[PDB]
Design a protein around this nucleic acid. Structure first.
Ligand SMILES: [K+]
Ligand SMILES: [Mg+2]
Ligand SMILES: [Mg+2]
Ligand SMILES: [Mg+2]
Ligand SMILES: [Mg+2]
Ligand SMILES: [Mg+2]
Ligand SMILES: [Mg+2]
Ligand SMILES: [Mg+2]
Ligand SMILES: [Mg+2]
Ligand SMILES: [Mg+2]
Ligand SMILES: [Mg+2]
Ligand SMILES: [Mg+2]
Ligand SMILES: [Mg+2]
Ligand SMILES: [Mg+2]
Ligand SMILES: [Mg+2]
Ligand SMILES: [Mg+2]
Lengths: 159, 207, 290
RNA sequence: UCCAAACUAAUUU
RNA sequence: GUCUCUGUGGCGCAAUCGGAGCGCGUUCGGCUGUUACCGAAAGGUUGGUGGUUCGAGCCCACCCAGGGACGCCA
RNA sequence: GUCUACGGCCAUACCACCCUGAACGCGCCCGAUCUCGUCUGAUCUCGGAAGCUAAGCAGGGUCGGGCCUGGUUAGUACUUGGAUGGGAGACCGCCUGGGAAUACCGGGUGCUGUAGGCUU
RNA sequence: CGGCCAAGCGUUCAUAGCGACGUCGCUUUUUGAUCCUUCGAUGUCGGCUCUUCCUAUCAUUGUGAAGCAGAAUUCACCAAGC
RNA sequence: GGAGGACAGAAACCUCCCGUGGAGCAGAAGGGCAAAAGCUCGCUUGAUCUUGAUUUUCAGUACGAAUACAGACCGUGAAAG
RNA sequence: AGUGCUCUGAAUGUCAAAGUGAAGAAAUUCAAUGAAGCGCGGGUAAACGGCGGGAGUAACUAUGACUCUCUUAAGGUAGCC
RNA sequence: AGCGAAUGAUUAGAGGUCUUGGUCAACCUAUUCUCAAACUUUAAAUGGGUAAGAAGCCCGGCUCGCUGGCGUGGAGCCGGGCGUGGAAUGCGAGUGCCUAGUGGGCCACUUUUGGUAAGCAGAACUGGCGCUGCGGGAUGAACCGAACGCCGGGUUAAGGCGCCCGAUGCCGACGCUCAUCAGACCCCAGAAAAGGUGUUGGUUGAUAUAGACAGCAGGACGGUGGCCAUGGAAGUCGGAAUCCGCUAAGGAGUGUGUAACAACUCACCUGCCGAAUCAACUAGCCCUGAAAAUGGAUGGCGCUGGAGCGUCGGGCCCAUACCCGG
């Protein structure tokens, strides 16, 4: 039976990358976390206060509370039969803004830019992105050359 | 006595080398890995014949030095005391274990065993043994490696390499690279001298 | 050789450099981490710090707040611009530290327009003073001191620029323990010893000392005061005339210059083509020499 | 009334 | 298998109290006609190998050479 | 063209060695009455301005070492799914999709924000 | 209980008879290992008696080999009739 | 580690140079750490008084331990803290 | 020596209830005083039971009368196997 | 994957030369062989999380005792305006109460731990058996196909189609193989190393009408026997040898087992014989290797121009599955 220790098996998870030891870069301290934005929870090893438990390393939740040094994140956790939402307090060394949301905020700012300018050209522009259609018909020039013949090579034995 | 060798033939356990953890292994039976005139240069002992395993298995250290011996005294007897250099290219690093039994605790209670010997885990295509000789002894290196096969459990193939000696450069291009100083013979092997670096090593190469 | 080289190839494959501004020896990232960083619930509020740096011939004083892009300087006041106000010389002593901190404050408060609201301590006592905010007005500009890598012992000139900035009207949390008039064995602050360091009286005494004992080292220690004719007995008023000239007109106006060409004063990088024929004619002229 | 044991095989009167 | 335990001068064996010894023997003077007694000197990888430590023969981990003790329903 | 102060990303920026550095600056530098420290004014602190780019620093250089980035390695190794595939086995082919790492061979050698200089 | 390889032994001579260092198997009369069956019970060692089966042959019939002169002996083959 | 310096040597102390952590941080191992989390000085008692929330084990109960706050009183520092 | 059993009871240490003394408004509390027993001291094995190791040594060898030693309450005697 | 990258483990030469090593090591530098569950610069496949709107977006204002240079910053509140519903595919969803039985499991593919192994012990992932019949595997909890109301018709799956036994009673296609223990279909119910001038393929190399190969043989071996030695030299050998025939090409011996001048004509041939041949590999089937006890098991009978093995075609046979119908 394994131990129920708080850092059991975090030999590589909470370690540091190679030649990225030492002083934390200072711009991880001057991000701004509003309430209700999506953060990625990772967890450094250089800072021991306020680190999340290992079951949250690599999860993603939204911010509900903001303190002097920390944050309150609502994270889904799949315990055995059901997913329940956990409220965890993490110092802000261990998190970062998630770019999974920001492509969606890139196109909501792109769609309102094109709905009040759609009508006067009679344009019904496409907004729903579609899942990669099959390739259309086209022509392929040989340019006078002929295609190179390929044939399998004989076997030989080295290693 | 040791167990019969079909007990420890297939690579079933994860590699268990001797370390801080597995203490007190017996020493391996094979201790000498190179043999013949070891101090022979690279310049004119050009043929290299290999022994390649066809199976994924593990070979005991008793059997590595049984084929060390039986291929030595054939090469001694027919290519002279110094007309060859053989090299065993497997080290017995994996440690096999034994569960000794029969006032201890009987049965499979406490079954993790004690270290008993060492084997070398070998793969498909992996070279077991190499011999370098004169070019006119191709008949005898094929015979000495054929007589070392009968000492090993699985299946092996005998193969004459395309490289020069124990080097990694093809024998078709070896003399041209020595001539144009792309290679430099130091000892048994050869140094590759690339076209980058500080230019004083170019100057001493072309003194 | 005989010894193992420590700086081999495997030494450099595993070497992590420190930060660019650490290995220049300019920034303490331990202190900066506690100084430029705002509480996360005071979200986009700035956190201003007064940056006092003393070179060998100048005193830089500037207020900055931190951004992800780099620090943003809001106001900066130098000490080599004090001869415009009438201090020709001694431009790095304790007195010009006060004048630079005073100039930095008054240049900031009219930049914001609060200059007549917060006047500061006009008559220099040298005693403890704190600007307190007035209800119904804008608050006092609250700022913190970044001494840097300086050893902050009692009498250090960075507290002179602090004392000038408090008297200029800024709100800087400080104590009087590191002003020059503090007495460590009594834990007592004088405010008259400290007042004379603002007026340059420690220098004025040493000028009168070298006049009456050496007179040849006097021309050596104070060769530029003699050229600008700065008598010891005219000096305390020479800063009083200077401080009022600061409060008269703290605005920094600057002159542009245009008539410059594109003269390379250094040397550009050699191209790849110039590099690999240079070796080709080194290899040629080596074989041609044998 | 303190303790106090032993003594060449090497021979010639 | 597991747990304790011993190892020290030629011999039996101390100190287990982190800061090298008894008895006997062996040399060597004496006494004696000549071989107990009297006097004095010498002698120790303190099993081995690493640890810990201000510091180890004393405390730790292992190896060895020895011992001892713990098991029974067929 | 370039520096200073404060930075951001933290080697394309580091290390060794050589060469050049106008003007500003930055430095080395000169001194110990005051402030403040020392076994020692060397460091630290303070007061200066005779000297100097020697060194730091900057720019350049090196068939340089590292580092960053491409090629090869290689559709290789491995791998998801599949078969009443093969083989005594160990293991191995094929189908269906994914897809690396050295050695080896090239290229590169800091970008940049805020404030303030200098360069005719 | 057998096989393969062949350093050696066999005055000479690897292999008549052998066979180190290796390595590949078979068998279920051993014992370990396991715990599938039986605890509303399968009488539990040996000897005695009696039958049948196996061959991995001790002898006998027919053979081959030898370091088989004869004699005795050893090694193999077909073979479990007796 | 190197090179030097009366006695002084394989080890005493002195000095310069190299030194990306190869040391140390009470202990097991793992992670972290260099104008530091190390070593040395100065001042101290935040090892104190409180009420909730959260995490970890998990039934998502308790203990234990731990993390963010908030209210007091305090220490230290020029100050940010 | 152990475990018992037994004798002795000296100033004996420990030691209950009652009794005595003091403190207190009282319940109560404290102190003094101390029976047997235990502890201390003898005796007792035809009581229960118990009754060692290690070295060296005779002039062929081998043995070991003798010698030295750690050691315990004694170290197994006459016998017998 | 890596180790000419740190930490460990480790093989060999080479180049340097300082010295408390005695030319040797040690040492250093550049290489080189082989490793790692409790090492790693690097680094997949499969995987884990979040997102893909009206609970949004854009406008104005208001509140605050929090924050504060500032009309700041933050949260809240109130109006007003915007539907192309902002990937695919499928689907009705939400929520409460009460509650039984269970808490001995076992098996299989892949990953995996202990063990020589086990129809052994212990995990992961999914499916199954337990709870479940049916067709197929002769027989079988678990394999393969497919899951079940009571029937008719049709058609399939896995598997089959000599006879048992439904279906090849095809003028089926091309080969391989002879076994005096043949072989014969997932799981699965029997074999290995090593061999075979057994046959059939293949790979590489070599010789050949300036005539090989195999067999008869025609001048068809000698001063030099040297050197090695009178334990083996004017035939032939357990130690280092090693030129020459006065030739058309020739021994200091493979060859008549040898202290012997013992003694016979191989070797190398140009005419005879006159056309192809030799060797080493390799892998198909078959054989040797291959021995246990009641008499016996491709299921049986049997089968050899196949009813065996390999690659294939057309038909055909039937499940409770699929389809149409009651
Ligand atoms: K019994
Ligand atoms: Mg500081
Ligand atoms: Mg002793
Ligand atoms: Mg009993
Ligand atoms: Mg100085
Ligand atoms: Mg310079
Ligand atoms: Mg210069
Ligand atoms: Mg380079
Ligand atoms: Mg012999
Ligand atoms: Mg079981
Ligand atoms: Mg019965
Ligand atoms: Mg019966
Ligand atoms: Mg037989
Ligand atoms: Mg007796
Ligand atoms: Mg059941
Ligand atoms: Mg299937």
């Amino acid at each position: 039976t394994n131990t129920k220790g708080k850092r059991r098996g975090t030999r590589y998870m909470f370690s540091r990358p190679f030649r990225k030891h030492g002083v934390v870069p200072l711009a991880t301290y001057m991000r701004i976390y509003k309430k209700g934005d999506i953060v990625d929870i990772k967890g450094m090893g250089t800072v021991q206060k306020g680190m999340p438990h290992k079951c949250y390393h690599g999860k993603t939740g939204r911010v509900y509370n903001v303190t002097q040094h920390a944050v309150g994140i609502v994270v889904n956790k799949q315990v055995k039969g059901k997913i329940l939402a956990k409220r965890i307090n993490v110092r802000i060394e261990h998190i970062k803004h998630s770019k999974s949301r920001d492509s969606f905020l890139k196109r909501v700012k792109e769609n309102d830019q094109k709905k009040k300018e759609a009508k006067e050209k009679g344009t019904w522009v496409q907004l729903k992105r579609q899942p990669a259609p099959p390739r259309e018909a086209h022509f392929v020039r040989t340019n006078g050359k002929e295609p190179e013949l390929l044939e399998p090579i004989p076997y030989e034995f080295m290693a | 006595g040791r167990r019969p060798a079909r007990c420890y033939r297939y690579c079933k356990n994860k590699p268990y080398p001797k370390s801080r953890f597995c203490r007190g292994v017996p020493d391996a039976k094979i201790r000498i890995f190179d043999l013949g005139r070891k101090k022979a240069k690279v310049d004119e002992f050009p043929l290299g014949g290999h022994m390649v395993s066809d199976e994924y298995e593990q070979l005991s250290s008793e059997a590595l030095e049984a084929a060390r011996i039986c291929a030595n005294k054939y090469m001694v007897k027919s290519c002279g005391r110094d007309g060859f250099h053989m090299r065993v290219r497997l080290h017995p690093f994996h440690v096999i274990r034994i569960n000794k039994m029969l006032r201890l605790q009987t049965g499979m209670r406490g079954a993790f065993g004690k270290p008993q010997g060492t084997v070398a885990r070998v793969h498909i295509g992996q070279v077991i043994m190499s011999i370098r000789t004169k070019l006119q002894n191709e008949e005898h290196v094929i015979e000495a490696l054929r007589r070392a096969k009968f000492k090993f459990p699985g299946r092996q193939k005998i193969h004459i390499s395309k490289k020069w000696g124990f080097t990694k450069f093809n024998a078709d291009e070896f003399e041209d690279m020595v001539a144009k100083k792309c290679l430099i013979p130091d000892g048994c092997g050869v140094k590759y001298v690339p076209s980058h670096g500080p230019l004083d090593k170019w100057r001493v190469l072309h003194s | 050789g005989f010894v193992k080289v420590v700086k081999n190839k495997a030494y450099f494959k595993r070497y992590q450099v420190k930060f660019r501004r650490r290995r220049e020896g300019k920034t303490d990232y331990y202190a900066r981490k506690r100084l430029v960083i705002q509480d996360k619930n005071k979200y986009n509020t700035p956190k201003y710090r007064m940056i006092v740096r003393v070179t060998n011939r100048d005193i830089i004083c500037q207020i900055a707040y931190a951004r992800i892009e780099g620090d943003m300087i809001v106001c900066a006041a130098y000490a080599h611009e004090l001869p415009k106000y009438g201090v020709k010389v001694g431009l790095t002593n304790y007195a010009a530290a006060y004048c630079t901190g005073l100039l930095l404050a008054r240049r900031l408060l009219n930049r914001f327009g609060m200059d007549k609201i917060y006047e500061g301590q006009v008559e220099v006592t040298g005693d403890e003073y704190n600007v307190e905010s007035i209800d119904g007005q804008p608050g006092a500009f609250t700022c913190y001191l970044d001494a840097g890598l300086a050893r902050t012992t009692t009498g250090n000139k960075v507290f002179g620029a602090l004392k000038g900035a408090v008297d200029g009207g800024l709100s800087i949390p400080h104590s009087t323990k590191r002003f020059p008039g503090y007495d460590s064995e009594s834990k007592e602050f004088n405010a008259e010893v400290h007042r004379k360091h603002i007026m340059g009286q420690n220098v004025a005494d040493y000028m009168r000392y070298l006049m009456e004992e050496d007179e040849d080292a006097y021309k050596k220690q104070f060769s530029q005061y003699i050229k600008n004719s700065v008598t010891p007995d005219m000096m305390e008023e020479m800063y009083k005339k200077a401080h009022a000239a600061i409060r008269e007109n703290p605005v920094y106006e600057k002159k542009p210059k245009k008539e410059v060409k594109k003269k390379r004063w250094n040397r550009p990088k050699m191209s790849l083509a110039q590099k690999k024929d240079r070796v080709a004619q080194k290899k040629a002229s080596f074989l041609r020499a044998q």
